[PDB]
Structure formats: C-alpha cells, structure tokens
Amino acid sequence: MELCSGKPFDAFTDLKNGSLFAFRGQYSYELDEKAVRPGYPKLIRDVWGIEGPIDAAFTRINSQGKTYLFKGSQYWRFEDGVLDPDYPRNISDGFDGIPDNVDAALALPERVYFFKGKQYWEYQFQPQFISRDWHGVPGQVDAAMAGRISVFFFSGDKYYRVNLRTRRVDTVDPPYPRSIAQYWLGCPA
Ligand SMILES: [Cl-]
Ligand code: NA
Ligand code: NA
Incomplete structure (x- = not known):
C-alpha cells in the first residue's frame, strides 16, 4: 500500500537524526528527506525480519539509538537495523x-x-489517564512519536501535536485532529 493512501498507521519510531519509520499492516516506510524514493513501501519482514502488523515502536535518544518494535507479548530491539542477540x-x-x-x-x-x-x-x-496529563489528546491512540520539541499522537487517519513544555495540544489552523497524509506527511493532493 502507498504511504499516502490516507489509511491509519499502526506505529511510528521516534525522530532520530532526521528520519523515522512508519508502520502500516505488513509495510514499513522509511521517512527521510534525503531519500530518493521517500516512503517507498517496503515489507516489515524484509526490513526488520519480523511479521507485521506491529503494535508500537520507539527509538531511544542515546548515542546507540536502538529501535524497539512491539507485537503482542514480545518486543525486538535493533541497532542500525540489525536485531540484537537474544531478542525477541x-x-x-x-x-x-x-x-x-x-x-x-x-x-x-x-x-x-x-x-x-x-x-x-x-x-x-x-x-494514569492519557487525557488527564496530555491535554487535548482524546484518550485512546493508535500510534505516537516524538520529535525534538513536540510529540505526535495518531488517531485513525488524523493526528495531534503536543508541545513538550506545556503538555498541551497546540493551537494550529486547521486545528488538530487533522489529516496525517495532508498535514503531517505533506502528501500530494
Ligand atoms: Cl507507536
Ligand atoms: Na499501534
Ligand atoms: Na512510537
């Protein structure tokens, strides 16, 4: 499936050195501005060596910058795309x-x-309850990821941006929740 299909996503890694991965179904999309084919649809099994769909993902901020993928009761930890030993x-x-x-x-x-x-x-x-501490985030989320100064929460085909200092959904135009494909990915019209 195409990145810009408008369908909901399953998981996102965290922005690391300007790039991240989005997950949907069996597909992994590398989001890098330097990509010659940005968001080319690749199979999760081909890139990460595991079957989709995945539940959630994150990338740590330290210099090793290991990526964690979660599915069911298990998780996998990768470094430079290689699965660490003794995972999952x-x-x-x-x-x-x-x-x-x-x-x-x-x-x-x-x-x-x-x-x-x-x-x-x-x-x-x-x-704790999501809506109590993340002001403006409705409660149930489908995926999330952190940038440098904001975090993003995804709900269906739309998303919210939360400012880290205030822990509040920012006031933008058109307001959140808005289309992932149009306003977060900048997909073609
Ligand atoms: Cl996620
Ligand atoms: Na998810
Ligand atoms: Na995530």
Whole structure:
C-alpha cells in the first residue's frame, strides 16, 4: 500500500537524526528527506525480519539509538537495523509493569511512555489517564512519536501535536485532529 493512501498507521519510531519509520499492516516506510524514493513501501519482514502488523515502536535518544518494535507479548530491539542477540524478549521481562498488546509508545528527547486504552505508563531505564496529563489528546491512540520539541499522537487517519513544555495540544489552523497524509506527511493532493 502507498504511504499516502490516507489509511491509519499502526506505529511510528521516534525522530532520530532526521528520519523515522512508519508502520502500516505488513509495510514499513522509511521517512527521510534525503531519500530518493521517500516512503517507498517496503515489507516489515524484509526490513526488520519480523511479521507485521506491529503494535508500537520507539527509538531511544542515546548515542546507540536502538529501535524497539512491539507485537503482542514480545518486543525486538535493533541497532542500525540489525536485531540484537537474544531478542525477541517478553515485554513483561524487559518492562516491568507494562502490559502486553500496547497501542503506542514514544521516547522523550531517559523516559519512555507506553499507551494502551485510556491509560499510559511511564517507564524509566503506575498508570494514569492519557487525557488527564496530555491535554487535548482524546484518550485512546493508535500510534505516537516524538520529535525534538513536540510529540505526535495518531488517531485513525488524523493526528495531534503536543508541545513538550506545556503538555498541551497546540493551537494550529486547521486545528488538530487533522489529516496525517495532508498535514503531517505533506502528501500530494
Ligand atoms: Cl507507536
Ligand atoms: Na512510537
Ligand atoms: Na499501534
């Protein structure tokens, strides 16, 4: 499927060195401005060596910058696209207190956040309600990712931008929630 199909996404990694990956179904899309074919649809099994769909993803901010993919009760950790030895592992073993089958995850510009249903967990290398602490985020999310100064939450075919200083959905025009394809990816009309 094409990146700009307008369909919802399943997971996003965090912006790292100007690039990130989006996931939808069996497909992995590398989002890099330097790409000659930006967002060329590749198979998750071909790029990451695992079957889609995936549940959530994040990338850590440290210099190793390892990427974590979550599916069901398991997670995989990669470095430079290569699966580390002794993965996959159980979420319950790597992330004590985090549930299986998460909806989304993100790593802050060291804190990671997991989202499932109306709740989210803070993990540092006690659930709370998403709408209580992320002002303007409706509750249930389908995917999330962090940039440098903002985080983004995805719901169906639309998304929200949250300012990290205020923890509030920013006021833009047209307002959030708005089309992922049109306003986040800049897809052609
Ligand atoms: Cl995600
Ligand atoms: Na994510
Ligand atoms: Na998801």
